[PDB]
Design a protein around this ligand. Structure first.
Ligand SMILES: Cc1cc2nc3c(=O)[nH]c(=O)nc-3n(C[C@H](O)[C@H](O)[C@H](O)COP(=O)(O)OP(=O)(O)OC[C@H]3O[C@@H](n4cnc5c(N)ncnc54)[C@H](O)[C@@H]3O)c2cc1C
Ligand SMILES: CCOC(=O)NC(=O)c1ccsc1NC(=O)c1nc2ccccc2s1
Length: 426
């Protein structure tokens, strides 16, 4: 049956040991849960996907961890209803490849494609197109949730059981095990993007670019930005914005199969600024997914409400001056949020930094937490392993609402993880 394994997140940190069940037989999974639900509850069970979450949500020290990747059956795809019916274990690379021939696009892609559907729902993932498409949960039309009582619940966003549906979205696996879901895809005539590229010189410029209205012309938008340069070079960004291309906008070479998928001395001087500027400035460039989107450390991500822009600028300044240097930095403006209590995204300034692990970093991020909290923002659980129950419960004021739903569906704490215990969501 199970195999005791040392599990971490993608951050390869905070390791715990659990029994890792790995079966393609869904019957076995159901019985593994009934087994846990009878043995008092103990340290319970958590589902695990491709383990791309940095946090400790896909691990359950001294408990059961169910690997879902074996359950990777695509059941159906329909180009007319735009619906795909797949097992939770299918990953989004797999799904993308299978659905392109139907002229269907995965409605929310994150930075890797190596994430399962279960993981995408459970962390309610977002991406480059959040401001136009929302997050993953917005596109789930149904799901089948294995609950603590051994029953499989068919959930929909509306009608009854909506509450448990929207508690499961962003619920980090703590409502039970998603076995199978139905996703509504985005119609597309190509696998290509038409991309505009802009380059800013200061943070104030970046922000201006994201509030001038131009953002409404693009469905996909994000930026790499400078978190190391002192002001006013601090916060300058390479912005990449675009939308899916039509067949008529493809060069003839590509129009045949439109849905096919397959530092020198100058560098820090004035000539290179011109290089990086000219090279990062373009209009109507045709790019495929890889070019446009998918080309020891502590990953840290937060969002600040749109209005609190001055506070957002202050936090960036804090980061630069902190002596903690991040090169890989992702800036994006989120759009409207959804009804999931524990959903990460809210409208406003979202940023992702990557800190090398060194002295006083742990203490510094704790400071950052307080500022993010102070300013009405929050951290993302799929990126976080160190924050306290305190900060988290204050960042997510509907956590109480969420918990009540969770206790309604799992009274005996049959489902559990490291994160649940740390953030007191158990
Ligand atoms: C390089 C990189 C880039 C990334 N970019 C983005 C991004 O742009 N946007 C974004 O939002 N995220 C991003 N992420 C994070 C990633 O999308 C999420 O952490 C996602 O949840 C990972 O999916 P997974 O299958 O690996 O889940 P895991 O890491 O295995 O598990 C994550 C959570 O999902 C739950 N879960 C998994 N399967 C099930 C199931 N079948 N039933 C119930 N619960 C389940 C687990 O219990 C756990 O709570 C990135 C991660 C990496 C490594
Ligand atoms: C890899 C480039 O990806 C993107 O352009 N990023 C996005 O558009 C985007 C939008 C909102 S959040 C986000 N990206 C993220 O949260 C990412 N985290 C990591 C960690 C390691 C490597 C790549 C990434 S991308």
């Amino acid at each position: 049956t199970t195999t005791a394994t040392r599990l971490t997140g993608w951050g390869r940190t905070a390791p715990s040991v659990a029994n890792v069940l790995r079966t393609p037989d869904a019957e076995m999974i159901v019985k593994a849960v009934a087994r846990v639900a009878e043995s008092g509850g103990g340290r319970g069970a958590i589902a695990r996907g491709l383990g791309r979450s940095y946090g400790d949500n896909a691990q359950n020290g001294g408990g059961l961890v169910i690997d879902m990747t074996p359950l990777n059956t695509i059941h159906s795809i329909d180009a007319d209803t735009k619906l795909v019916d797949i097992d939770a274990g299918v990953n989004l690379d797999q799904l993308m490849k299978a659905a392109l021939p139907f002229g269907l696009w995965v409605p929310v892609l994150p930075g890797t494609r190596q994430v399962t559907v279960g993981g995408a729902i459970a962390c309610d993932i977002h991406g480059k197109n959040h401001h136009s498409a929302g997050s993953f949960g917005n596109h789930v039309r149904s799901m089948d949730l294995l609950t603590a009582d051994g029953e499989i619940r068919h959930l929909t966003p509306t009608g009854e059981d909506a509450e448990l549906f929207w508690a499961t979205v962003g619920g980090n696996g703590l409502t039970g095990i998603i076995m199978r879901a139905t996703i509504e895809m985005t119609p597309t005539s190509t696998a290509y993007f038409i991309a505009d590229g802009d380059v800013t010189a200061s943070l104030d410029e970046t922000i201006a670019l994201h509030s001038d209205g131009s953002e409404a012309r693009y469905t996909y938008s994000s930026a790499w930005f400078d978190a190391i340069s002192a002001p006013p070079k601090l916060g300058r960004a390479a912005v990449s914005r675009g939308r899916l291309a039509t067949v008529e906008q493809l060069p003839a070479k590509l129009r045949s199969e439109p849905l096919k998928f397959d530092a020198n001395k100058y560098t820090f001087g004035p000539i290179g600024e011109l290089w990086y500027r000219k090279s990062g400035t373009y209009r109507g460039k045709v790019q495929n997914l890889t070019q446009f989107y998918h080309p020891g450390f502590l990953q840290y991500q937060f969002v600040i409400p749109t209005e609190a822009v001055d506070e957002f600028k202050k936090i960036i300044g804090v980061i630069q001056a902190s002596g903690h240097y991040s090169f890989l930095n992702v800036f994006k403006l989120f759009g409207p949020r959804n009804q999931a209590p524990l959903s990460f995204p809210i409208p406003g300034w979202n940023i992702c930094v990557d800190f090398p692990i060194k002295d006083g970093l742990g203490k510094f991020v704790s400071e950052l937490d307080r500022r993010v909290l102070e300013f009405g923002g929050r951290l993302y659980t799929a990126k976080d392993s160190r924050t306290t129950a305190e900060t988290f419960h204050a960042m997510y004021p509907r956590v109480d609402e969420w918990i009540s739903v969770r206790r309604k569906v799992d009274p005996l704490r049959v489902f559990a993880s490291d994160m649940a215990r740390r953030l007191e969501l158990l």
